[PDB]
Amino acid sequence: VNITKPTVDLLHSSCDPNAFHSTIQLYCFVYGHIQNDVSIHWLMDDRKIYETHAQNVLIKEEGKLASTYSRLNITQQQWMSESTFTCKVTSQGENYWAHTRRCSDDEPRGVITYLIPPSPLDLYENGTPKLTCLVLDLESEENITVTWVRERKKSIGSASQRSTKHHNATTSITSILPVDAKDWIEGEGYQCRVDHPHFPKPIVRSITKAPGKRSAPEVYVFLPPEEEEKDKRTLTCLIQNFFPEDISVQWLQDSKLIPKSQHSTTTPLKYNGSNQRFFIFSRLEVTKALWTQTKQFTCRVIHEALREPRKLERTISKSL
Amino acid sequence: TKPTVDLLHSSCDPNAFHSTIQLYCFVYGHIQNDVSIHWLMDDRKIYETHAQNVLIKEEGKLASTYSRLNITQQQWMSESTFTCKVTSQGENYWAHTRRCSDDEPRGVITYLIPPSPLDLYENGTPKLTCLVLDLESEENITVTWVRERKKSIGSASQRSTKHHNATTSITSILPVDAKDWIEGEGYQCRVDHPHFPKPIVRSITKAPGKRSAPEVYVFLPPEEEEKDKRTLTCLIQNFFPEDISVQWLQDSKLIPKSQHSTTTPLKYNGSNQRFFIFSRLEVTKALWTQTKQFTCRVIHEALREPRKLERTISKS
Amino acid sequence: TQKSVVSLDPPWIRILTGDKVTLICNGNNSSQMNSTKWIHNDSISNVKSSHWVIVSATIQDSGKYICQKQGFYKSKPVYLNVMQEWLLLQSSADVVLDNGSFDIRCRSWKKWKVHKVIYYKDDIAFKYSYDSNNISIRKATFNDSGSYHCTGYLNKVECKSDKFSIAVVKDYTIEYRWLQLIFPSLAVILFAVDTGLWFSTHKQFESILKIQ
Amino acid sequence: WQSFLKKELEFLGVTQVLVGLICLCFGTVVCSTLQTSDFDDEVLLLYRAGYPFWGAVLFVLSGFLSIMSERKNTLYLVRGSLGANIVSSIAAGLGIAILILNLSNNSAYMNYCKDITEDDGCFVTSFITELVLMLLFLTILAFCSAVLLIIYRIGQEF
Amino acid sequence: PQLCYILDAILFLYGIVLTLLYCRLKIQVRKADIASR
Amino acid sequence: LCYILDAILFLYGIVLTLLYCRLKIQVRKADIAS
Ligand SMILES: *[C@@H]1O[C@H](CO)[C@@H](O[C@@H]2O[C@H](CO)[C@@H](O[C@@H]3O[C@H](CO)[C@@H](O)[C@H](O)[C@@H]3O)[C@H](O)[C@H]2NC(C)=O)[C@H](O)[C@H]1NC(C)=O
Ligand SMILES: *[C@@H]1O[C@H](CO)[C@@H](O[C@@H]2O[C@H](CO)[C@@H](O[C@@H]3O[C@H](CO)[C@@H](O)[C@H](O)[C@@H]3O)[C@H](O)[C@H]2NC(C)=O)[C@H](O)[C@H]1NC(C)=O
Ligand SMILES: CC(C)CCC[C@@H](C)[C@H]1CC[C@H]2[C@@H]3CC=C4C[C@@H](OC(=O)CCC(=O)O)CC[C@]4(C)[C@H]3CC[C@]12C
Ligand SMILES: *[C@@H]1O[C@H](CO)[C@@H](O[C@@H]2O[C@H](CO)[C@@H](O)[C@H](O)[C@H]2NC(C)=O)[C@H](O)[C@H]1NC(C)=O
Ligand SMILES: *[C@@H]1O[C@H](CO)[C@@H](O)[C@H](O)[C@H]1NC(C)=O
Ligand SMILES: *[C@@H]1O[C@H](CO)[C@@H](O)[C@H](O)[C@H]1NC(C)=O
Ligand SMILES: *[C@@H]1O[C@H](CO)[C@@H](O)[C@H](O)[C@H]1NC(C)=O
Ligand SMILES: *[C@@H]1O[C@H](CO)[C@@H](O)[C@H](O)[C@H]1NC(C)=O
Ligand SMILES: *[C@@H]1O[C@H](CO)[C@@H](O)[C@H](O)[C@H]1NC(C)=O
């Protein structure tokens, strides 16, 4: 069976000051595909748009060939932010693309550097903490050197780096430096430097652990509410009175780990009147059939300020 | 018959040089064996069109077609008005387009803030706010308000503030009616200045989607907590849209909003959008044991009348 | 006749690499042919014109300059500084007199043009401008002395400039005040010599008085 | 009148040594502290001629030779100290002329200064003017001492 | 300002006169020592 | 502070011109009477 390449367009409407809807309609036309073998998915800056409910409309059929298009609704503020919108066309296993963006000038977009600390789960349970330096908005990956220095000692490990080409014609470079735990508890600082022959000076970002007074978190668990008898059951885990805000929460269903996409955790919120305390809420919603299978759930919390080996579990059981 | 004429156009591909902008105007459902399409720029004729009338589909007497144009980048970035002229059944049909204007001229940032549900469904006095930031000075800045149906608009209350970073901000507050905002009336805030090449126009409307009533459950303080303070929690979930207000009470007395915290809403599980929040109130030990009761009330658009729902927690 | 005056036609005393700066002697618009002596970094240069034109400044142009016209005296030296930063706060003077004037400017490097500029003096903001222009400060008093810096956006990235100290004085410091501390420092040697001679003279006279 | 000068001879040798050592001490600080490329050569004419070096050397040598000829009185240092005194007189007259031209140059510069503390130029010119004045006074005194010892030694053989 | 700058000159003159007058008494005392010996 | 240096050097000149006068009158009364 031969492979027939279709033609993919990406057209859209414009803004209207004399209107009140403030929406932009995006059209991705596909001409010359095969019947019942097409699928159009939408992206915005390498992030898939799940909550849109896009509509797919057939145009015509010419024997063994047909034409379809898909329509997307976006706001005016999303369009005016100069983000790239992509429709990905899948036909017989191959992929075809079309991109669009608001027209602008050739202004030299600056590069941004982010340095993020290791997670407490790798720090205090797994034992392999890594720092990652993220470099964004590069026109090309060539002639870019990313170096790592320390503050107290000198023996740095090997830093593996990777390059990614995005849909918005920008390149990203991420380098990962594996560090030891005890140097991070003791409080030494690291630094990531990014250089280029066209830069006047290197861009330097430094990091260390959060300074302050350490407080161990007190966690509590709640049963499903007494007014709930529907098809789903909600379980809660209130964790409060801790500093700093770096914390890790994971649920355990009968001593088996639950994936991180099955539960959500709120952003930490400060309180206690400049005493620097935080609280979060952890929510995990299961169905009635999973709840009624005599399981035994567990909310496990790992924090720096806890006593060794730095973990805390509370048990929710329907019998007790 | 009324053919549907809409104008769609291509734009910048960041992966290509893309010096040609491509204009399309579609004639949907027009009568059979008709239509001629002419293109105009800045209300003047164009004879270098090279249009290609391509047949789309045929459905009985109705038929569909489109025309295609080839313009340069500098003819599009000049912010001229391009219109496709459609002559179907003797009648004349129009469809205009331009480039979208700069929403931040001279680095001026504008926000349009919707009314709170407490003012909307309980107090009855909603207000719209147009916050204009990052100004060099107040002078020669005019803020205008536009309705949708009636020309009778309310009086705006404009005030200014100089900030710590030597920037001036202007806030304009327009009182609106609750009924018109309930039916879905749109409003506009137009900011003008002589140095602006184009005015800044911002619109707002009641948020669209499928309405869902929230479910609220209240929790007692935890049984392991016998310390100097007690913590009371309110769980509100399964509500669309995101606009909600939560209040705490002490024997029908309003606790001030600085004594409790609420979390940022989080989307859950798709495909229709639902949100959940947590409201936390921490009282002292002596205040809890004074044989009182506490309530947690919410106000939402999707609730039944009078858009208020209460959950009472007490030890008795 | 009088002392020569050396001035810059782009009068900013802090510039970046690749900038154009023109050094002028006593003052006219006439690049004369072999009539002006120029001294750079305490060394005679080969440029004998009345206008020293630098087309592209380098780090090796950051020294001291003295011009001398024919029939005139040497000039008061001026100082140039060529730096390489993401954001530079320029100035036309680092020390200014009372009831004087100076300008400041926030300038970026090599087509990274800056917007939304905020000017600070001793970590207190006093001026906001969308564009990078002159901020003229007229009728200088004692309150204008402090540390100056600026912030801005290259495209959407916030960058900060290094702090620059500008001092306002009632009179210029003239850098050679210890030279007049020589003559008392010579008198304290001469009087010590006098006392050392007096002690020996009195000892010799007291020893010859015991002989008689 | 010849007995009025035989007693006062080694003091006349001492003052030349003192004038020469003060000349060397005055030249040393100008050699070390001052960055001479910032100032004019008309103001620093006493330094570009090198006067506080050879004047110091000749004054010290003439004073030392007169002192040693007084305290030795052999018939070889006498009639050899007269040459060391007349070359010191020639050096003193040349130094007087050089200091007079430098004083006129200093006055010509200091006409064009509204104050003594305008900048480095007027201050350095004023300091060099005091140096010129109290080198001229010591040069006149040492020249008179050398000429009067020359007169005393000439009148013995006449 | 100018008064102290003038006063260093008369201080120098006083010091010069002082050492020139002390050296004469020094040599006269030494000659008395070498004559009474 | 030029004036305190002028004061201490003037005191030095006063005490040294007193001691010179003392030594001068001692040399006078020694050499006058052989
Ligand atoms: C082109 O598309 C890429 C892919 O989406 C864009 O990269 C994304 O840029 C955002 C904004 O800088 C990044 O968010 C940041 O993430 C860090 C690390 O989590 C966080 O600390 C920051 O606060 C911020 O939220 C995002 O991570 C990044 N995505 C990837 C995969 O690197 C890029 O910005 C687009 N470029 C243009 C010019 O539109
Ligand atoms: C100079 O300082 C002022 C305040 O001292 C800054 O104004 C603040 O700017 C932020 C960012 O735009 C505003 O936050 C926004 O608020 C709206 C409305 O609540 C919200 O919808 C947005 O999501 C965002 O959070 C903030 O309200 C505003 N503060 C005030 C009092 O208006 C200003 O940005 C500073 N300018 C510079 C150049 O640093
Ligand atoms: C270096 C600058 C800062 C000042 C230099 C001045 C003095 C340190 C020098 C210059 C000449 C010197 C004089 C040269 C010759 C003599 C004669 C000399 O007489 C004798 O030989 C008497 C016998 C004895 O030595 O006891 C006594 C020291 C004196 C006055 C010296 C004392 C120290 C003087 C004044
Ligand atoms: C003139 O002198 C200046 C000293 O102020 C020199 O500037 C320095 O140059 C070196 C490299 O040559 C740099 O490492 C320094 O950072 C510079 N200093 C400053 C303050 O900028 C200048 O190079 C000299 N020029 C010549 C031609 O000799
Ligand atoms: C997109 O907007 C159009 C115009 O209002 C509307 O008819 C259509 O239903 C919208 N599509 C979705 C998926 O909301
Ligand atoms: C990149 O590096 C190469 C050598 O590795 C060099 O020749 C070139 O000039 C650099 N810059 C660019 C833009 O290629
Ligand atoms: C206009 O430009 C597009 C893209 O370059 C091209 O496909 C089209 O043929 C052009 N129009 C004409 C009439 O040539
Ligand atoms: C801005 O400053 C520069 C240099 O100080 C000067 O040449 C120019 O005339 C100034 N412009 C204005 C408008 O003040
Ligand atoms: C200068 O500062 C002082 C104290 O900070 C203040 O009293 C004075 O009024 C200021 N001068 C002016 C002209 O404002």
PDB file of N, CA, C and O in Angstrom, chain A residues 71-87:
ATOM      1  N   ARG A  71     -11.990  22.552  13.854  1.00  0.00           N
ATOM      2  CA  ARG A  71     -12.069  23.930  14.311  1.00  0.00           C
ATOM      3  C   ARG A  71     -11.744  24.009  15.795  1.00  0.00           C
ATOM      4  O   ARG A  71     -12.133  23.134  16.574  1.00  0.00           O
ATOM      5  N   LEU A  72     -11.026  25.062  16.181  1.00  0.00           N
ATOM      6  CA  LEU A  72     -10.640  25.300  17.563  1.00  0.00           C
ATOM      7  C   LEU A  72     -11.028  26.719  17.957  1.00  0.00           C
ATOM      8  O   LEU A  72     -10.962  27.636  17.135  1.00  0.00           O
ATOM      9  N   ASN A  73     -11.438  26.894  19.211  1.00  0.00           N
ATOM     10  CA  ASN A  73     -11.759  28.203  19.767  1.00  0.00           C
ATOM     11  C   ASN A  73     -10.706  28.567  20.805  1.00  0.00           C
ATOM     12  O   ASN A  73     -10.474  27.805  21.749  1.00  0.00           O
ATOM     13  N   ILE A  74     -10.071  29.726  20.630  1.00  0.00           N
ATOM     14  CA  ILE A  74      -9.135  30.261  21.607  1.00  0.00           C
ATOM     15  C   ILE A  74      -9.533  31.697  21.918  1.00  0.00           C
ATOM     16  O   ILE A  74     -10.232  32.356  21.146  1.00  0.00           O
ATOM     17  N   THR A  75      -9.080  32.177  23.071  1.00  0.00           N
ATOM     18  CA  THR A  75      -9.362  33.540  23.480  1.00  0.00           C
ATOM     19  C   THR A  75      -8.437  34.516  22.756  1.00  0.00           C
ATOM     20  O   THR A  75      -7.447  34.130  22.131  1.00  0.00           O
ATOM     21  N   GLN A  76      -8.785  35.801  22.837  1.00  0.00           N
ATOM     22  CA  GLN A  76      -7.953  36.836  22.231  1.00  0.00           C
ATOM     23  C   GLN A  76      -6.642  37.013  22.981  1.00  0.00           C
ATOM     24  O   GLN A  76      -5.615  37.325  22.368  1.00  0.00           O
ATOM     25  N   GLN A  77      -6.658  36.819  24.301  1.00  0.00           N
ATOM     26  CA  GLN A  77      -5.448  36.979  25.099  1.00  0.00           C
ATOM     27  C   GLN A  77      -4.448  35.864  24.830  1.00  0.00           C
ATOM     28  O   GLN A  77      -3.238  36.075  24.970  1.00  0.00           O
ATOM     29  N   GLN A  78      -4.931  34.676  24.459  1.00  0.00           N
ATOM     30  CA  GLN A  78      -4.032  33.597  24.063  1.00  0.00           C
ATOM     31  C   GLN A  78      -3.389  33.884  22.715  1.00  0.00           C
ATOM     32  O   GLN A  78      -2.223  33.540  22.490  1.00  0.00           O
ATOM     33  N   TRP A  79      -4.136  34.508  21.802  1.00  0.00           N
ATOM     34  CA  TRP A  79      -3.592  34.830  20.489  1.00  0.00           C
ATOM     35  C   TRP A  79      -2.589  35.976  20.565  1.00  0.00           C
ATOM     36  O   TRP A  79      -1.548  35.938  19.902  1.00  0.00           O
ATOM     37  N   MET A  80      -2.875  36.995  21.379  1.00  0.00           N
ATOM     38  CA  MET A  80      -2.008  38.165  21.465  1.00  0.00           C
ATOM     39  C   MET A  80      -0.743  37.928  22.280  1.00  0.00           C
ATOM     40  O   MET A  80       0.114  38.816  22.326  1.00  0.00           O
ATOM     41  N   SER A  81      -0.598  36.767  22.914  1.00  0.00           N
ATOM     42  CA  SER A  81       0.611  36.427  23.651  1.00  0.00           C
ATOM     43  C   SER A  81       1.733  35.925  22.753  1.00  0.00           C
ATOM     44  O   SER A  81       2.827  35.661  23.265  1.00  0.00           O
ATOM     45  N   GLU A  82       1.467  35.786  21.446  1.00  0.00           N
ATOM     46  CA  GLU A  82       2.410  35.296  20.433  1.00  0.00           C
ATOM     47  C   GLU A  82       2.913  33.892  20.762  1.00  0.00           C
ATOM     48  O   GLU A  82       4.114  33.634  20.845  1.00  0.00           O
ATOM     49  N   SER A  83       1.968  32.980  20.954  1.00  0.00           N
ATOM     50  CA  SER A  83       2.243  31.560  21.100  1.00  0.00           C
ATOM     51  C   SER A  83       1.948  30.848  19.788  1.00  0.00           C
ATOM     52  O   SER A  83       1.150  31.308  18.970  1.00  0.00           O
ATOM     53  N   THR A  84       2.606  29.711  19.594  1.00  0.00           N
ATOM     54  CA  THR A  84       2.473  28.932  18.372  1.00  0.00           C
ATOM     55  C   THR A  84       1.420  27.850  18.567  1.00  0.00           C
ATOM     56  O   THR A  84       1.446  27.126  19.566  1.00  0.00           O
ATOM     57  N   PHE A  85       0.493  27.755  17.620  1.00  0.00           N
ATOM     58  CA  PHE A  85      -0.586  26.781  17.656  1.00  0.00           C
ATOM     59  C   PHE A  85      -0.396  25.778  16.527  1.00  0.00           C
ATOM     60  O   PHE A  85      -0.218  26.167  15.369  1.00  0.00           O
ATOM     61  N   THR A  86      -0.444  24.495  16.867  1.00  0.00           N
ATOM     62  CA  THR A  86      -0.126  23.405  15.956  1.00  0.00           C
ATOM     63  C   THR A  86      -1.315  22.463  15.841  1.00  0.00           C
ATOM     64  O   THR A  86      -1.977  22.169  16.839  1.00  0.00           O
ATOM     65  N   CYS A  87      -1.595  22.002  14.625  1.00  0.00           N
ATOM     66  CA  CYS A  87      -2.488  20.871  14.410  1.00  0.00           C
ATOM     67  C   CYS A  87      -1.677  19.708  13.855  1.00  0.00           C
ATOM     68  O   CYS A  87      -0.965  19.861  12.857  1.00  0.00           O
TER      69      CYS A  87
END
